[PDB]
Amino acid sequence: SKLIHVPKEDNSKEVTLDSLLEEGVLDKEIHKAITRMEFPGLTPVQQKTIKPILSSEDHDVIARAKTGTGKTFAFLIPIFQHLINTKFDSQYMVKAVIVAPTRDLALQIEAEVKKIHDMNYGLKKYACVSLVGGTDFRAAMNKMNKLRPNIVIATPGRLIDVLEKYSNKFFRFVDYKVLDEADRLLEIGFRDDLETISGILNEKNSKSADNIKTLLFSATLDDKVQKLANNIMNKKECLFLDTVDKNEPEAHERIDQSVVISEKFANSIFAAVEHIKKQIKERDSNYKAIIFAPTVKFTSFLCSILKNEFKKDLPILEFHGKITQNKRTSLVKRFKKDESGILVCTDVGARGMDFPNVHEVLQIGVPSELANYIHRIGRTARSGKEGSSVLFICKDELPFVRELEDAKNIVIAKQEKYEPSEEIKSEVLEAVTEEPEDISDIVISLISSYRSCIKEYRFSERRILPEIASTYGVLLNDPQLKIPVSRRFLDKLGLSRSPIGKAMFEIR
RNA sequence: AAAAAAA
Ligand SMILES: Nc1ncnc2c1ncn2[C@@H]1O[C@H](COP(=O)(O)OP(=O)(O)O)[C@@H](O)[C@H]1O
Ligand code: BEF
Ligand SMILES: [Mg+2]
Ligand SMILES: [Mg+2]
């Protein structure tokens, strides 16, 4: 398909809700909804995205815009507009399907649709239903039958379940499908699912197999995604709406980035505790921050430490895929409202999630993928607000930082070293309740995690893996100790032959 | 054992 580029214009023409109203692009009902939100004016992506989406319905849309710049409304406003000027057709059928890589992001997008509804009750006739895992399947279908939504927000897994069973009933008249965080949804582990989704929607469409128009949105994507999505893009042409220069870094420039480099991985923990401590003092507990960790078990562990240290000063929230979905939703809306607190989470919260006025984004270790560094720090400095970010890593993780410059052109100017005092180590380690068996599982989970991204971040396996494993000895206050495992376990890991295995483990 | 995703 023909991929048409539309680079970031220098000055360009101003676009406004009023202008789109007078121009005939937008109806008064949707115009009334967004105006009441009292935004200063449409964001760059929104100005560059709305009219093209409503344009000649023989083209697809790819849109790149930095984090926190209102990409959600950039495709929700047009969708609503499409629904208005087709209100006398199909009516009780899904006309827009929005897909997100995490449940909480899908539920967030739903909430944003509900905000549009609350600003104009006239738009409530265009109902919306979310379809995500961890929710009652029957209840969602009853909601489907009752509301007969024109908009569906979903995660790939639950959506396929519904489509396999009810495609004929609701999805024979889809006109739009949206891939939010598109690049992620087009990666291995999601790509096959979205191809399954796209195929079913096309096969079931009443007009034609190429009727559906596809919208791709993310803060991180290139031309590679257009190739990765070639099977889900129906139209013959495709617009690339980019509000970012080719050479410009995808990371938000307003974020004050820094990296704290330590000798070991374990004392990135100590550095972060000292940083948070310093931050709570200076800000007088007026501190809202998100700290990312590489692993669920380590996240839960890091959470346990931060409670013992800072629960007296701030709420500490634990957020990952092993948290029950009810609790995930509960803490997400709390941290959205709260003025302060520390959200401790995995990369489940790396993309899309919009928490107003986060002061800082902290990172212990590396993200699950290179791009997610951009999305991680993107949780702060949103909607014009300021923000800072700190990356806590060890010496053996520097290749990730270098790769960050080589690939994404992200240069972290502020760099500093760190060595923990004996007092801090005693303070933190004295406040661990975990048995040696628990510490083992935690470090093992980190070994598995770091082993899987050796190639991505150009890590030296002979160096990084022993360092991660050595965390076990540090936490038990005995650097000489190795992780106790069985011969079968060491074999299951496949390092029975590798010298690195012996350096990490002790066969008991 | 390892981040998401019908779990
Ligand atoms: N036109 C606008 N002007 C000011 N703020 C906006 C505008 N559009 C959206 N926002 C704000 O941006 C926040 C998050 O936007 P979001 O859709 O998450 O952007 P992205 O998806 O690109 O990260 C929302 O809380 C919203 O209040
Ligand atoms: F890119 Be945004 F944060 F969804
Ligand atoms: Mg978004
Ligand atoms: Mg924020």
Residue numbers in the entry: 88 to 595
Reproduce, without paraphrasing, sentences from the article in which this PDB structure was first reported.
(D) Model for RNA duplex binding and unwinding by Mss116. of short duplexes bound to D2 by excluding one RNA strand and bending the other. hydrolysis leads to core re-opening and enzyme turnover in DEAD-box proteins and perhaps other SF1 and SF2 helicases. ‘clamp’ ssRNA and form a highly stable closed-state complex.
A10-RNA + NDP-BeFx, N = A, C, G, or U. However, each base interacts differently in the ATP-binding pocket.
